[PDB]
Amino acid sequence: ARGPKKHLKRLAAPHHWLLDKLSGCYAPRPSAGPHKLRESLPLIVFLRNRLKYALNGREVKAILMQRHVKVDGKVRTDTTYPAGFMDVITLDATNENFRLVYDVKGRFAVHRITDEEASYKLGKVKKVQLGKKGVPYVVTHDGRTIRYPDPNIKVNDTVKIDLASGKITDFIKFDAGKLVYVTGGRNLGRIGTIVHKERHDGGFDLVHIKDSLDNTFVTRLNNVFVIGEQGKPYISLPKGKGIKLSIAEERDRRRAQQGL
Amino acid sequence: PRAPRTYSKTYSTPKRPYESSRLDAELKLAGEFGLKNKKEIYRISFQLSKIRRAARDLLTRDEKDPKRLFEGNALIRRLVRVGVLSEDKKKLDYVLALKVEDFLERRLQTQVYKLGLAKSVHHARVLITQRHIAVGKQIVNIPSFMVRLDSEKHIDFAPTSPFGGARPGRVARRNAARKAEASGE
Amino acid sequence: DAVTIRTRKVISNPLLARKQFVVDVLHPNRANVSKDELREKLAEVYKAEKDAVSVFGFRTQFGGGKSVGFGLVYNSVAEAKKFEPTYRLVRYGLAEKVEKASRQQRKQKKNRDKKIFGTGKRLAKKVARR
RNA sequence: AUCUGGUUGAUCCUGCCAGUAGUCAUAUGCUUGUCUCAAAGAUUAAGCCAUGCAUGUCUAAGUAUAAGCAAAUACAGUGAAACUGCGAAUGGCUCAUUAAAUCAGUUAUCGUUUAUUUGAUAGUUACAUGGUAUAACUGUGGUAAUUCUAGA
RNA sequence: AUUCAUAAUAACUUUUCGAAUCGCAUGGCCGCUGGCGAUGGUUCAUUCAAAUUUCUGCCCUAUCAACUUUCGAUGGUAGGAUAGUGGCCUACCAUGGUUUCAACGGGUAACGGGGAAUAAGGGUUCGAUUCCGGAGAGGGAGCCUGAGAAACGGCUACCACAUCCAAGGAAGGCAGCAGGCGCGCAAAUUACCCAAUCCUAAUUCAGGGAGGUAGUGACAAUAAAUAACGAUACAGGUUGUAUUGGAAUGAGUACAAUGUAAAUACCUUAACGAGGAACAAUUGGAGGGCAAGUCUGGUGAGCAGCC
């Protein structure tokens, strides 16, 4: 290739979008933006495929150009704008708010939230450094840069951000006994508490997690996102609390309830 | 281009063509159940072959292996639903004892004979293809349709036919008209 | 026999000022029902003007007797006229078919014009003199 | 999964052959009623090509005195041409070359560039400057000829 | 883990940037002051990316046993060039580097991989071709514009072909779509459309042979018609063999609606539509391997994978 690529063939798209095989030759390619391509969710997929508010790609554009949809409090009109983990989406008519968060299968859920919670989002701290003239700043996973952080904040900590003004109001240290959300790999979507951490100089650190049914699993540190103290999430959790079930357990519950 | 459509072949051919003893056994089934081809027999033995392959594999796994529990129960459940396996023989070792006649016995073509309605397996086939039989509300016209145990209560003549309550057919109507017209002569 | 119409999976959609739903029809002893008849009966049950009702995509069950499709009803005739595709409006007679030339002819005109620089009122005069 | 036939007048071996079944493996012959689904100038010649088409683009928001159309004395609706900005480096086709090369899994940049998107970020040096300027346009022309273009 | 981030001092530059721009609205205080947006701009971070790079892995050949160093082969110091590391190139200096654990040379009717066929197990054969990566636009070389190209639906030259002409000159690249010639055992229409999937632009609106629809199509795959049932006569224990009677239906055709961007077809349906139901199923065989003729007429070229 002689430059950047503009098209994404279907089948090459991320599997968690749950596109069907046969309806066309192509898939929507996400624009450059706050989140990585492989793990974003384009607005067209949200409005059309999940909420069913639109029948066509054409009807999605008719919605956006009326300026009904805003993301993190700002109006967006690009059909392929890449929303991602922890973003807040608001539809003013209908009076609905959603937060993007994973099901335990590792798919973006349709999760409704109150008008109160729509004020803020969480952010994972990716680096902390001095800028020009010696002013310190922090960088979050969604690419915000915030001036004059509290001197205690360090990498891997988590930070609470007011969506108006865009300023830090609280933070939590990375430490044992915190709640965590897993955001990558085979265990994507599980929740548990930190048991301990393994140092590997020049390598990748590993973290040991325990869930409330005291199953245990291990993941690379890059996949771990802190979300609160033990038993006290800073945000409303999706239905099912991130508890993984075996295939035998799922079959029993369905035919018990759905099968009466 | 669009993603490929998948497809697969549904029958297997016997590897020795002129094994005389086999030719006799096949012809008795076709005469008994009113089949039109050997292929209709090959299709069934092909399905039965794969069921045994899967079951025989699972029996190498220990009991209380989670995979043997999950998939073994599914297979048994699925055969009981169509009535191929008795709910008394509801155990995996008995799956290896099934034979071809257990499946042919469940085809819609033969059930419509055992219930009455028709009066030979040859008469039964004609009615199905000519759209006279319904299962529930739906008209069905495929003889090889496997009748699940629930459906047997609901096999009856279609509402939109003679024998089911509709108008007489095209030939009956023609005869009445000519005779009526002649009776006016 | 009397026709029965039912609606299912009803969604209200303020973002496009419409309601959208499945249309399910039982019609024993007739081939099917015309879209024009369905538009009338839906109009009176949802208390709407007929021009605000749109209906598409039907198929009928094997062996007959039943059909299924999709239906829309807009909050006004004006809003329908802006959100609806033009081809559907033509079916209802709410719009007039446009009369462009065939696709091959338009393309050939374009390629002829690319060879002219400027408006071409000049050049014509020069050729007339030759 | 575990076949059958062929070497003395009469047998048993070695050995190979013939038969049998499959092929998202091609071709070809005879024959052909219904529903669903669907590959298709790779193999020989990365050989040669008539004709048509396949890349352009405007919003309330860069530049309007068309001698365009349609009806607030600087202008104000709609809008051809042309200047300006952006794109044409994506897509589509083919398999000639190429044997530690390409490629696959796994690493590194404390060894470097990056239109665009997103977030931060410049008190420090006239009530509005000039053509060292020109297109479209008006008007005079050249050549058998092209998406040729000269002088004013 | 740093001669990191960042800050300070003395200077340097041929002097980088630090808004002479556009829409809508018309408020506050007694000619001053004010709102919501658009487009630009320096540096840092982020996103879409690029370049280089570590480890291990490839088909046949010894009728290829020694190979590289002039003309960079292996290494050291300094410089040049590059976005940047490095014999990448130059000057000087040293004499190194690979190999029977197969180097070097030759062959491939060789693009790599995910994969495909063949099911006891182990294997054998194949992968031009729907996804990922590389390369090329008749053959070699060079370069402009740009963030990005050594671009070919951009330019310049040479080599090989080849078009028009007033003979002075001018113009060229289907291994894009459709189509033609040639080749061969071997492969479709110079059709309709942006309605869907998506992409580009100053953009809801324009454009797209990308893509979709129909035509051709026994490559391969799924379902499945060509007849069912009585009477009579005869024979047999309810089953065979021949004159005779009512019923049933789609193949096909067609009003209509549905389908579709508009259509064709499928699904549904008024009317019509079977008695030699001529509305008539073929392709290979009958010594053995290998299912099935001591039949009957002719003859003394034919048959046969094998006997």
From Swiss-Prot, chain A:
Keyword terms: Cytoplasm, Isopeptide bond, Phosphoprotein, Ribonucleoprotein, Ribosomal protein, RNA-binding, rRNA-binding, Ubl conjugation
Family matches, as Pfam families: 40S_S4_C, KOW, Ribosomal_S4e, RS4NT, S4
Superkingdom as given in the UniProt entry: Eukaryota
Compartments in which it is found: Cytoplasm
Domain S4 RNA-binding, first and last residues per copy: 41-104
Location in chain, cross-link Glycyl lysine isopeptide (Lys-Gly) (interchain with G-Cter in ubiquitin): K61, K133, K160, K167, K173, K178, K210, K232
PTM-bearing positions, type Phosphothreonine: T114
MF term (GO), any: RNA binding
Listed SMART domains: S4
Entries under InterPro entries matching the protein: KOW, Rib_uL2_dom2, Ribosomal_eS4, Ribosomal_eS4_C, Ribosomal_eS4_central_region, Ribosomal_eS4_central_sf, Ribosomal_eS4_KOW, Ribosomal_eS4_N
Sites bearing Phosphoserine, chain numbering: S31, S246
Record-linked Gene3D superfamilies: 2.30.30.30, 2.40.50.740, RNA-binding S4 domain
Primary site of residence: cytoplasm
Biological process per Gene Ontology, one example term: cytoplasmic translation
A GO-annotated cellular component: 90S preribosome
Comment field (misc): Present with 573 molecules/cell in log phase SD medium.
Subunit and partners: Component of the small ribosomal subunit (SSU). Mature yeast ribosomes consist of a small (40S) and a large (60S) subunit. The 40S small subunit contains 1 molecule of ribosomal RNA (18S rRNA) and 33 different proteins (encoded by 57 genes). The large 60S subunit contains 3 rRNA molecules (25S, 5.8S and 5S rRNA) and 46 different proteins (encoded by 81 genes).
Function: Component of the ribosome, a large ribonucleoprotein complex responsible for the synthesis of proteins in the cell. The small ribosomal subunit (SSU) binds messenger RNAs (mRNAs) and translates the encoded message by selecting cognate aminoacyl-transfer RNA (tRNA) molecules. The large subunit (LSU) contains the ribosomal catalytic site termed the peptidyl transferase center (PTC), which catalyzes the formation of peptide bonds, thereby polymerizing the amino acids delivered by tRNAs into a polypeptide chain.
Family per similarity comment: Belongs to the eukaryotic ribosomal protein eS4 family.
Protein name from the UniProt record: Small ribosomal subunit protein eS4A
UniProtKB/Swiss-Prot annotation, chain B:
Modified residues (Phosphoserine): S183
SUPFAM superfamilies tied to this protein: Alpha-L RNA-binding motif
Superkingdom of origin: Eukaryota
Region described as Disordered: spans on this chain: 159-185
Occurrences of domain S4 RNA-binding (ranges): 106-180
Keyword line: Cytoplasm, Isopeptide bond, Nucleus, Phosphoprotein, Ribonucleoprotein, Ribosomal protein, Ribosome biogenesis, RNA-binding, rRNA processing, rRNA-binding, Ubl conjugation
Entry-linked Pfam families: Ribosomal_S4, S4
Cysteines joined through disulfide linkages: none
Chain residue numbers at which the record places covalent cross-link Glycyl lysine isopeptide (Lys-Gly) (interchain with G-Cter in ubiquitin): K179
GO MF annotations in UniProt: rRNA binding; structural constituent of ribosome
Further comment: Present with 106000 molecules/cell in log phase SD medium.
Function statement: Component of the ribosome, a large ribonucleoprotein complex responsible for the synthesis of proteins in the cell. The small ribosomal subunit (SSU) binds messenger RNAs (mRNAs) and translates the encoded message by selecting cognate aminoacyl-transfer RNA (tRNA) molecules. The large subunit (LSU) contains the ribosomal catalytic site termed the peptidyl transferase center (PTC), which catalyzes the formation of peptide bonds, thereby polymerizing the amino acids delivered by tRNAs into a polypeptide chain.
Protein name: Small ribosomal subunit protein uS4A
Protein species of origin: Saccharomyces cerevisiae (strain ATCC 204508 / S288c) (Baker's yeast)
Gene name of this polypeptide: RPS9A
Swiss-Prot record, chain C:
Amino acid composition bias (Basic residues), ranges on this chain: 103-113, 122-130
UniProt GO cellular component terms: cytosol; cytosolic small ribosomal subunit; mitochondrion
This protein's record includes keyword Kinase: no
GO terms under biological process: cytoplasmic translation; maturation of SSU-rRNA from tricistronic rRNA transcript (SSU-rRNA, 5.8S rRNA, LSU-rRNA)
Gene Ontology MF, one: structural constituent of ribosome
UniProt subcellular location: Cytoplasm
Region (Disordered): 100-130
Post-translational modification: N-terminally acetylated by acetyltransferase NatA. Also partially acetylated by NatC.
Claim: Cytoplasm is one of the keywords in the record: yes
Cross-link (Glycyl lysine isopeptide (Lys-Gly) (interchain with G-Cter in ubiquitin)): K19
Principal location: cytoplasm
Top-level taxon of origin: Eukaryota
Pfam family, one: Ribosomal_S24e
Other facts: There are 2 genes for eS24 in yeast.
Function of the protein: Component of the ribosome, a large ribonucleoprotein complex responsible for the synthesis of proteins in the cell. The small ribosomal subunit (SSU) binds messenger RNAs (mRNAs) and translates the encoded message by selecting cognate aminoacyl-transfer RNA (tRNA) molecules. The large subunit (LSU) contains the ribosomal catalytic site termed the peptidyl transferase center (PTC), which catalyzes the formation of peptide bonds, thereby polymerizing the amino acids delivered by tRNAs into a polypeptide chain.
Quaternary structure annotation from Swiss-Prot or TrEMBL: Component of the small ribosomal subunit (SSU). Mature yeast ribosomes consist of a small (40S) and a large (60S) subunit. The 40S small subunit contains 1 molecule of ribosomal RNA (18S rRNA) and 33 different proteins (encoded by 57 genes). The large 60S subunit contains 3 rRNA molecules (25S, 5.8S and 5S rRNA) and 46 different proteins (encoded by 81 genes).
Stored PANTHER family: 40S RIBOSOMAL PROTEIN S24 (PTHR10496)
UniProt similarity note: Belongs to the eukaryotic ribosomal protein eS24 family.
Identification of the protein by name: Small ribosomal subunit protein eS24A
Species per Swiss-Prot/TrEMBL record: Saccharomyces cerevisiae (strain ATCC 204508 / S288c) (Baker's yeast)
Lineage start: Eukaryota, Fungi, Dikarya, Ascomycota, Saccharomycotina
